[PDB]
Nucleic acid binder design. Sequence first.
DNA 1: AATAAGCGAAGTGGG
DNA 2: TCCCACTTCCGCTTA
Length: 92
Amino acid sequence: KIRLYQFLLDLLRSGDMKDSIWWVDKDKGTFQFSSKHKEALAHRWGIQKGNRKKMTYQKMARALRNYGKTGIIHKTAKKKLTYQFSGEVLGR
DNA sequence: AATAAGCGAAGTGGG
DNA sequence: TCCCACTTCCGCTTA
Ligand code: NA
């Protein structure tokens, strides 16, 4: 099964949900979710995973928090809904 | 208050 | 056995 960071990177590369997520500085790997349209993207994540319950942005962000300990994805301080892929994730 | 967002122990998958 | 990679639940804090 695809991992959450790869799901998000693939969305950013494809442009398929441009109203829900976008690059802020692609060279740095920084991206941001839409306040108003993030739930649609969270829903897609849960459907792609085949999870039992409906996925919410809150649950998806709880998973993202675990990446922050390992550095896979860092949450940008002093910003909302903004994150940054590690250099390793971006190299493929 | 209402709403949004940040923060951070037990249950489920698939090894 | 016991870790992976989240998922779900619960609830407090900050804006
Ligand atoms: Na526990």
